[PDB]
Amino acid sequence: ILNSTLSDIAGFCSGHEHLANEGSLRCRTDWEQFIGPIERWGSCNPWEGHFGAVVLPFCKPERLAVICYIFEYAFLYDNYRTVRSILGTKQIQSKMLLELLSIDAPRAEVVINSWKEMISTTAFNNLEEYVDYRIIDTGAPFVDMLMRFGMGIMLTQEEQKRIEPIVKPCYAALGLANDYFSFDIEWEEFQAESDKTTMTNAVWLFMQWENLNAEQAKRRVQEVTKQYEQQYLRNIADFAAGEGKLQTYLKAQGYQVPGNVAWSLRCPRYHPWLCKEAASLLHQLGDEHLLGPAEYISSLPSKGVREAFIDGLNVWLVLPDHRVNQLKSIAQTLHNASLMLDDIEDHSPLRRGRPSTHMIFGTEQTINSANFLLIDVMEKVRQLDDPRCMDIYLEEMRNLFIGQSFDLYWTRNGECPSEEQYLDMIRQKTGGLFRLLTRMMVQIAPVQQKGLETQLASLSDVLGEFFQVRDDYKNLTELDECKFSYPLIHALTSQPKNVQLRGILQQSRSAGGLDVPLKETVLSHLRQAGSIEYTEAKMGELMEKITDSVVSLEGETGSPNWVVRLLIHRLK
Amino acid sequence: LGDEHLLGPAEYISSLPSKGVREAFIDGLNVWLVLPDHRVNQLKSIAQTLHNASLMLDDIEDHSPLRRGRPSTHMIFGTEQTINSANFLLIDVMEKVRQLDDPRCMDIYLEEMRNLFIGQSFDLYWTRNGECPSEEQYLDMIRQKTGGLFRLLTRMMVQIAPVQQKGLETQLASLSDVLGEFFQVRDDYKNLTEEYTGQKGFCEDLDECKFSYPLIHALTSQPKNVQLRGILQQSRSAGGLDVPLKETVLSHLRQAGSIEYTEAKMGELMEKITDSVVSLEGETGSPNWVVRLLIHRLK
Amino acid sequence: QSFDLYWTRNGECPSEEQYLDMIRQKTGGLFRLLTRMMVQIAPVQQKGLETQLASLSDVLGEFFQVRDDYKNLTELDECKFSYPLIHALTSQPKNVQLRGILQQSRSAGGLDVPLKETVLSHLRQAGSIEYTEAKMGELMEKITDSVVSLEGETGSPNWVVRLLIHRLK
């Protein structure tokens, strides 16, 4: 049942205007207060019944006030200014949810889990085709959840499925009866708007569905939809004494069709003229821990490769002393961040004898300072007073991170690089910082310096590789974290079945590092298969190209660079 | 050559389900500022990448194996690769910030992100070293760690908006700072009682000895609670607290009113949020119903 | 067995050709050994049979290893490779998530429950589970051809084998 005390039809049926106006005078204005003026007389019907009243007569008198608002808003949803409309839209569909959810949150969720579900779901030559298309249009299943919200019901998915066959053709009859009386001018709009293909109303489809007549189709909806509605006018008898809180509600749920029939036969929504008197009837805290790790790493002994490189190019590009000091500050900060992070991804307990930053301040607080150092440098690349150095900084630091991403992949997974692949990785890690300072020194170099760009950025690539190949030679001659090196790649390629060598490398990847007896065994294998000799050949080839670039560059400037030449002799 | 590993921890965590708050904050703050739609879809991409980079590093410095049930990013791609990808994201937002065509949007980004790391530095110090924050110091930190992203986005919406609403920056930033406090204080309560248990873990703040508004009160109201300080020290020396130990920790918090104290401050935060919302509704004169439903969902 | 321990410890992903050669000499080793030993100590006449009976024994070794693969994945700890996993790692050369989950297993014991569900998600998205049922159906066809063939020559319907074949399904 439900609550009663609270309160054949036209060839069919064998078997709240005040707040509605308030909801209208809200919605009839809200859609124009926020969105814009509207028309078409949404639901006003003082004689045949306002759409909400006839369709939804019974509900606890605390809900319909929003279903009224929903109902007035329902048709209008199917109905700089663009963005103003857009922002106005999302405001009305929040004027509703707040009012809706503010009372029956579980039902409202269920309603929203059906409203949005229906909203998402909602957003002909033979009988069956458009019927299911038409069933969705009414979205009455959600109005049944609104009736569940109207009478505090919660028919479970199976509780529905028990009654669903009894209540499925509800929304079939609702739309078909809607198809009857909505036909009118809507059929002409379908002739007025010629584009539209096949009619969203069952009446005209019987022309190609049943090969029937339009007036016959109207009475067909009167009598075949009657055969289809006596289906309901005979059905509810079955469930009354079959498997059968909501029993009279089920009747009211089915009584929405006579109301749907009712509302539709004589509403101004379909016959306007009365509307000019329809209303007449009615209306008449400090940087002490962030900077900590940075200060420690910027206090340890250094060698000065990055700074000596800048004074080297200052001869060929001549920059003011003010600028050169800034670029040396960027070089230090951008290199200290690399040292802090790389030591983490080496589990390295020491740095040049002294303890590492992560062994004093911790792993977590060191990453925070390292990530912040990138932001600090970008404050310095903006003090260089040039809009292009910022672009160089961002496009050249991405290359640096791409190279490091590949280094961390091979080290962890355990696969060997190809010599072609490995030499490109070091062209972007150790050559990334050299390329950055070269391309930033050129752009802020006072005038001239036009025909340098390609030659100065190619020397840096060769110069970056030389340092890393040197380190591989230096470290190996006189793997503890199982890092691939130029000597080791050769051995694993020249000797594809050196099982002993491949065994020690896996042992380092499991235990966490080799020992003295095992490290000598690795070095013994490398000497026996070349490696050392090959690395000394690549250092010779790379160093031949460095001198040629310097000599070639010294021909386009005239001035011989003795600062670069002296540093070269300290690099042999 | 080719990224294929840099954008691998940054595309895994984007796929994971979100409870989007910042996107709703930007979309609900546009009713007062009315910003062109193309610009709004840019200020929402900055929010995702900036917030996603935070989660990557947060899980690394929590040793959390899970995130929204699904595995964390440092368990699928390792710890070293995740850190490298997190650093890249700040550089990516830099490119994204530049294409907003405003030279002062840049000064906001560098200035605001300095405070986002200042607040994070104190949190890590208090956790690693066990130093107990005072109530005043704790509230300062959460204002520059959680309200840091809200403040950053709020001041960038103002700068790139039509100038007919340029006299709001003071109040709109005040709302963001209070709203930052309400989120972490709400999280602390939803972590201690029974609520947040699967997204990140059951009483996970206890495991990493993370301090909360409840715990600070208990440690300050009772100077001679030797039982409580021993459990927390056990957490700091044995990875975490087993189920019997965590149950005792709660028993000491309801015995000093720490849980009832949180329900007193939490309401005040929400109150201030709603209070400011009424104020800006009388100036602009367009009742912000997008933020009022958000306020309701927040409760 | 030497190849299996090499791939597992060193992480070297096998190839479709090399994985089937291995399981033919590891699981099909005991079947082959007994098959060739009953032939030798039996009444002499039946020596034109060793070729087919060894071929059946080698195929039966494969079916008992591929069956185990589609018994442990449907419903990884020591980074053991399998017929489904090899396909996913070959069909998808840029599946970085899968190659990262496996490396986690090698570094710290075995995969946890949440990490193991993800592994099954990548194998279903590449059709690796579908592929295994194709090979298992193919191999079972080969066995049925052999029993039918050996039945015709010797003239003795082997009903003991046929029940065992039906037991394997």
Side-chain angles (χ1 to χ4, degrees):
Chain A
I1 59 145
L2 30 57
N3 188 0
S4 74
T5 59
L6 203 150
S7 276
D8 176 276
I9 289 305
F12 281 154
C13 297
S14 57
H16 204 331
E17 188 102 2
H18 40 279
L19 270 188
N21 281 131
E22 169 260 10
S24 99
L25 297 161
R26 278 143 82 263
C27 212
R28 256 58 146 78
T29 55
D30 262 334
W31 201 277
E32 337 179 307
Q33 172 39 20
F34 292 172
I35 331 302
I38 26 76
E39 92 299 348
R40 158 67 195 282
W41 216 231
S43 62
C44 276
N45 192 5
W47 315 267
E48 188 52 71
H50 175 284
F51 158 69
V54 243
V55 158
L56 289 203
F58 309 98
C59 55
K60 334 156 280 292
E62 62 263 26
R63 313 290 175 91
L64 199 139
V66 71
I67 305 79
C68 149
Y69 193 38
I70 296 162
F71 277 176
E72 325 315 298
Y73 160 83
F75 334 112
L76 317 172
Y77 213 55
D78 214 24
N79 274 19
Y80 159 71
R81 201 218 84 266
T82 308
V83 86
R84 182 50 92 200
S85 81
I86 283 154
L87 305 183
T89 331
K90 273 186 73 19
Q91 258 203 102
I92 291 306
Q93 21 179 358
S94 179
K95 204 66 132 282
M96 295 226 329
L97 315 204
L98 211 38
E99 301 305 20
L100 158 59
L101 240 166
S102 81
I103 306 107
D104 214 315
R107 232 113 302 177
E109 286 143 32
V110 157
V111 157
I112 295 154
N113 298 352
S114 161
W115 155 265
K116 162 56 52 188
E117 169 213 45
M118 167 218 46
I119 283 310
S120 38
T121 317
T122 55
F124 312 131
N125 40 282
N126 81 80
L127 211 63
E128 185 264 352
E129 306 160 313
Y130 152 95
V131 169
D132 79 322
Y133 194 97
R134 195 270 318 148
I135 290 169
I136 308 150
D137 223 302
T138 53
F142 154 71
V143 192
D144 132 68
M145 266 58 113
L146 260 199
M147 265 310 283
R148 279 186 233 179
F149 183 76
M151 309 214 100
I153 351 167
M154 238 337 274
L155 323 177
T156 86
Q157 77 306 321
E158 215 54 15
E159 258 163 45
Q160 202 49 75
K161 170 52 58 176
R162 297 168 15 202
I163 56 191
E164 234 173 60
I166 288 96
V167 199
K168 282 145 199 273
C170 182
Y171 333 114
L174 287 152
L176 273 148
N178 153 268
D179 289 325
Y180 194 128
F181 310 102
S182 77
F183 189 62
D184 321 350
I185 303 97
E186 182 200 9
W187 161 231
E188 161 206 10
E189 315 287 343
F190 223 138
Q191 298 178 287
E193 219 201 338
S194 41
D195 176 304
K196 333 170 37 177
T197 311
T198 59
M199 192 205 178
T200 324
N201 197 107
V203 180
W204 180 76
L205 314 172
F206 292 145
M207 292 326 88
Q208 20 270 136
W209 268 4
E210 320 186 293
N211 312 138
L212 176 77
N213 155 48
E215 296 81 299
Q216 268 186 285
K218 282 281 252 217
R219 49 112 149 169
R220 194 73 156 131
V221 176
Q222 195 55 282
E223 41 85 359
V224 88
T225 298
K226 195 66 224 274
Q227 292 143 51
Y228 301 137
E229 176 207 30
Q230 309 206 122
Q231 188 214 354
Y232 319 141
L233 288 276
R234 293 182 183 174
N235 259 338
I236 67 165
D238 316 341
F239 179 64
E243 285 321 315
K245 193 257 268 175
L246 69 124
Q247 268 35 258
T248 314
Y249 148 72
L250 267 213
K251 292 153 86 273
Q253 179 62 41
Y255 292 162
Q256 294 164 5
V257 170
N260 162 48
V261 170
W263 160 63
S264 319
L265 165 114
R266 212 222 157 172
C267 62
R269 152 149 278 212
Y270 300 151
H271 69 57
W273 30 99
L274 304 193
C275 65
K276 328 338 176 273
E277 58 91 12
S280 75
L281 300 184
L282 328 164
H283 87 298
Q284 289 143 8
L285 216 286
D287 314 68
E288 55 179 347
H289 307 102
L290 180 56
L291 277 186
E295 309 266 350
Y296 181 65
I297 206 60
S298 75
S299 84
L300 299 190
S302 168
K303 55 213 161 293
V305 165
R306 243 66 46 166
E307 313 50 46
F309 172 87
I310 289 165
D311 309 274
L313 297 181
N314 203 21
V315 183
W316 281 323
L317 291 128
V318 52
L319 301 104
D321 175 303
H322 187 6
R323 302 295 224 219
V324 175
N325 273 117
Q326 302 200 273
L327 281 152
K328 275 197 286 215
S329 212
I330 290 138
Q332 294 178 227
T333 321
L334 237 35
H335 184 66
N336 296 345
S338 315
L339 293 194
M340 283 191 282
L341 282 171
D342 163 78
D343 255 1
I344 274 161
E345 327 160 346
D346 261 299
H347 294 14
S348 162
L350 292 177
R351 158 83 50 177
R352 306 171 214 121
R354 313 216 22 201
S356 323
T357 322
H358 90 267
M359 281 268 290
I360 281 187
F361 297 94
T363 318
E364 307 104 324
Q365 211 158 261
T366 285
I367 300 161
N368 198 265
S369 314
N371 301 356
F372 164 70
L373 278 204
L374 321 172
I375 307 286
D376 250 8
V377 171
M378 311 205 277
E379 276 150 286
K380 308 210 211 84
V381 194
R382 294 182 25 103
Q383 297 200 122
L384 268 174
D385 325 310
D386 216 17
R388 256 287 280 182
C389 299
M390 192 86 238
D391 177 22
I392 296 146
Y393 182 88
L394 295 157
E395 76 206 8
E396 206 64 87
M397 191 85 48
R398 173 191 159 83
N399 289 335
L400 198 137
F401 279 115
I402 288 173
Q404 173 92 19
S405 86
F406 262 106
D407 193 10
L408 289 177
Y409 180 39
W410 295 328
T411 292
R412 188 204 188 219
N413 266 237
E415 28 185 358
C416 191
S418 94
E419 177 197 3
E420 194 42 69
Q421 295 213 286
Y422 175 73
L423 276 149
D424 203 275
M425 172 248 275
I426 39 160
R427 229 162 287 160
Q428 290 176 336
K429 271 187 29 151
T430 322
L433 214 81
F434 281 116
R435 216 169 336 129
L436 184 78
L437 297 165
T438 282
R439 302 174 65 202
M440 271 166 59
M441 246 186 293
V442 168
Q443 170 96 14
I444 65 150
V447 218
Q448 309 98 230
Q449 318 323 311
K450 293 321 172 213
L452 291 153
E453 204 31 39
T454 180
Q455 309 214 55
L456 273 183
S458 282
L459 158 50
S460 285
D461 294 354
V462 188
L463 206 143
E465 294 170 339
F466 181 73
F467 274 66
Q468 186 79 44
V469 171
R470 174 151 152 289
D471 250 13
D472 297 7
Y473 183 72
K474 292 290 306 320
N475 264 27
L476 186 95
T477 285
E478 41 75 63
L479 228 228
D480 209 342
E481 267 267 344
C482 210
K483 299 276 180 112
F484 298 86
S485 64
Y486 197 79
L488 202 93
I489 298 151
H490 182 230
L492 301 189
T493 278
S494 52
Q495 313 214 292
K497 31 260 188 301
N498 200 321
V499 159
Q500 276 142 48
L501 193 36
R502 278 190 183 63
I504 319 148
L505 300 173
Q506 180 50 45
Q507 149 83 7
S508 169
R509 279 178 48 38
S510 304
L514 298 180
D515 312 314
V516 174
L518 280 96
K519 280 168 192 144
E520 311 316 280
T521 310
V522 178
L523 217 155
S524 193
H525 281 310
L526 286 171
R527 280 198 268 254
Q528 183 274 300
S531 142
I532 345 269
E533 284 327 289
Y534 208 17
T535 302
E536 289 173 280
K538 203 62 181 43
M539 260 166 40
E541 197 75 70
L542 285 169
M543 181 75 148
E544 161 76 40
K545 285 190 62 22
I546 280 161
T547 306
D548 299 350
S549 323
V550 165
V551 173
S552 179
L553 277 158
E554 254 162 6
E556 281 152 35
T557 80
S559 64
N561 221 315
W562 297 106
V563 184
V564 180
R565 284 171 91 62
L566 164 155
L567 291 166
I568 281 314
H569 186 7
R570 254 161 171 181
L571 227 41
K572 271 186 174 100
Chain B
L1 270 180
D3 323 305
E4 151 202 340
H5 308 86
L6 211 51
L7 300 174
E11 280 260 273
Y12 164 70
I13 212 165
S14 325
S15 78
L16 288 201
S18 34
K19 72 213 161 293
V21 175
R22 272 127 191 116
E23 293 53 6
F25 182 70
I26 301 149
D27 203 328
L29 221 51
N30 202 39
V31 196
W32 294 320
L33 294 189
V34 204
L35 231 151
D37 178 59
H38 43 97
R39 291 299 162 100
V40 191
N41 295 113
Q42 302 180 266
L43 259 169
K44 275 211 279 302
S45 73
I46 294 144
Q48 277 171 0
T49 49
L50 225 34
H51 171 65
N52 277 221
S54 152
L55 309 162
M56 296 201 210
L57 298 156
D58 178 320
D59 287 50
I60 293 201
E61 325 157 298
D62 260 295
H63 302 63
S64 265
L66 304 181
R67 173 151 280 294
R68 316 130 167 166
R70 239 159 295 179
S72 35
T73 325
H74 62 66
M75 305 274 271
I76 271 164
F77 300 98
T79 297
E80 291 59 23
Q81 262 183 111
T82 290
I83 298 165
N84 212 55
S85 211
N87 299 15
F88 184 47
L89 292 196
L90 318 177
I91 290 282
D92 304 341
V93 177
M94 263 298 337
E95 294 186 40
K96 276 193 261 283
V97 155
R98 279 185 64 82
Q99 316 141 12
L100 267 62
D101 278 25
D102 231 348
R104 274 262 311 151
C105 245
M106 181 85 68
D107 252 350
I108 300 181
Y109 181 87
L110 310 179
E111 169 165 294
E112 271 315 327
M113 274 258 294
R114 174 197 193 52
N115 306 340
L116 196 126
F117 290 130
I118 279 178
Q120 186 79 46
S121 74
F122 279 109
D123 159 72
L124 306 161
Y125 178 47
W126 292 336
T127 285
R128 183 171 185 258
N129 278 54
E131 282 245 10
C132 187
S134 71
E135 217 171 349
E136 301 330 284
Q137 284 169 290
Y138 186 81
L139 292 181
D140 266 20
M141 181 257 288
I142 43 165
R143 203 180 330 261
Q144 283 154 20
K145 164 153 82 63
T146 295
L149 220 75
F150 287 117
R151 204 151 30 91
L152 175 57
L153 278 35
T154 284
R155 309 179 36 184
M156 291 207 287
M157 301 215 58
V158 179
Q159 263 274 350
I160 72 162
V163 298
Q164 50 249 27
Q165 42 250 349
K166 284 248 153 166
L168 255 46
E169 185 70 270
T170 89
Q171 311 158 50
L172 268 169
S174 100
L175 176 49
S176 311
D177 257 28
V178 172
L179 204 139
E181 262 172 18
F182 181 82
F183 258 98
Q184 199 108 61
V185 169
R186 185 179 143 280
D187 185 327
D188 294 343
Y189 184 110
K190 260 174 57 39
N191 237 40
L192 281 203
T193 55
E194 269 276 0
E195 278 72 272
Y196 267 155
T197 48
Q199 217 269 14
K200 126 254 272 296
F202 160 71
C203 287
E204 244 222 5
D205 36 22
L206 297 190
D207 294 302
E208 283 284 297
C209 288
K210 263 52 171 91
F211 296 94
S212 53
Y213 190 85
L215 194 58
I216 291 158
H217 178 233
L219 282 204
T220 315
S221 45
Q222 319 216 337
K224 275 74 60 58
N225 198 358
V226 202
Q227 265 194 44
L228 198 48
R229 294 151 212 261
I231 304 154
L232 297 169
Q233 184 53 51
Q234 155 88 354
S235 192
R236 239 179 324 267
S237 147
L241 299 176
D242 317 52
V243 189
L245 271 162
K246 314 211 114 185
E247 274 292 323
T248 278
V249 186
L250 319 169
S251 322
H252 283 281
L253 292 154
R254 334 181 72 72
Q255 183 254 300
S258 307
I259 279 305
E260 91 79 33
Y261 208 14
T262 313
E263 307 149 30
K265 104 128 332 116
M266 234 144 29
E268 152 254 319
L269 304 160
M270 204 23 129
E271 155 258 310
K272 268 127 28 103
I273 291 151
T274 70
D275 132 83
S276 33
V277 170
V278 155
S279 164
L280 289 107
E281 252 157 14
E283 279 82 75
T284 278
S286 67
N288 205 8
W289 289 110
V290 184
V291 76
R292 263 198 194 140
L293 161 81
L294 255 58
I295 270 177
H296 162 290
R297 164 181 91 71
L298 215 62
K299 301 187 295 289
Chain C
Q1 184 83 250
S2 73
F3 284 144
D4 179 22
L5 308 161
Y6 179 47
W7 297 331
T8 286
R9 191 199 173 225
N10 295 263
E12 307 225 352
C13 171
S15 77
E16 191 96 340
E17 185 48 21
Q18 289 169 306
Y19 184 82
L20 293 171
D21 189 37
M22 184 259 305
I23 68 175
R24 174 191 340 280
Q25 294 195 180
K26 172 188 62 49
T27 308
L30 224 68
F31 283 115
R32 220 165 37 229
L33 170 63
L34 309 160
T35 279
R36 301 182 42 190
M37 267 185 68
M38 319 212 281
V39 169
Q40 263 274 350
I41 57 192
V44 200
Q45 303 93 358
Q46 327 145 323
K47 260 67 178 305
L49 226 60
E50 201 255 350
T51 317
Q52 289 148 270
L53 264 169
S55 87
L56 171 56
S57 100
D58 247 7
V59 165
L60 245 180
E62 266 156 10
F63 190 80
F64 267 99
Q65 193 59 68
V66 193
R67 216 184 72 99
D68 223 307
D69 302 323
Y70 184 110
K71 190 146 302 314
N72 253 9
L73 249 62
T74 84
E75 204 134 312
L76 299 180
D77 286 70
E78 270 233 41
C79 274
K80 266 48 188 265
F81 293 103
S82 53
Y83 202 61
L85 193 47
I86 285 195
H87 178 227
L89 285 195
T90 278
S91 149
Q92 318 257 358
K94 18 267 190 302
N95 200 357
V96 203
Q97 313 204 8
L98 204 56
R99 284 170 191 59
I101 298 163
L102 296 186
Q103 191 42 56
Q104 176 72 38
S105 149
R106 250 194 292 294
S107 321
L111 298 180
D112 282 28
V113 195
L115 283 94
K116 269 154 154 52
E117 269 92 69
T118 299
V119 182
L120 307 181
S121 319
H122 297 281
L123 293 158
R124 285 160 183 302
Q125 145 183 347
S128 268
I129 273 295
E130 228 44 66
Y131 198 16
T132 295
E133 311 163 303
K135 186 91 156 53
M136 273 190 12
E138 189 217 350
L139 274 166
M140 171 85 77
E141 164 267 0
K142 257 198 237 187
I143 305 158
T144 281
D145 307 327
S146 288
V147 190
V148 153
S149 172
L150 272 145
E151 261 174 26
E153 327 188 3
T154 206
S156 306
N158 210 297
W159 284 114
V160 190
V161 159
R162 272 194 193 153
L163 169 76
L164 294 169
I165 271 294
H166 163 101
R167 203 211 59 161
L168 271 193
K169 330 280 288 301

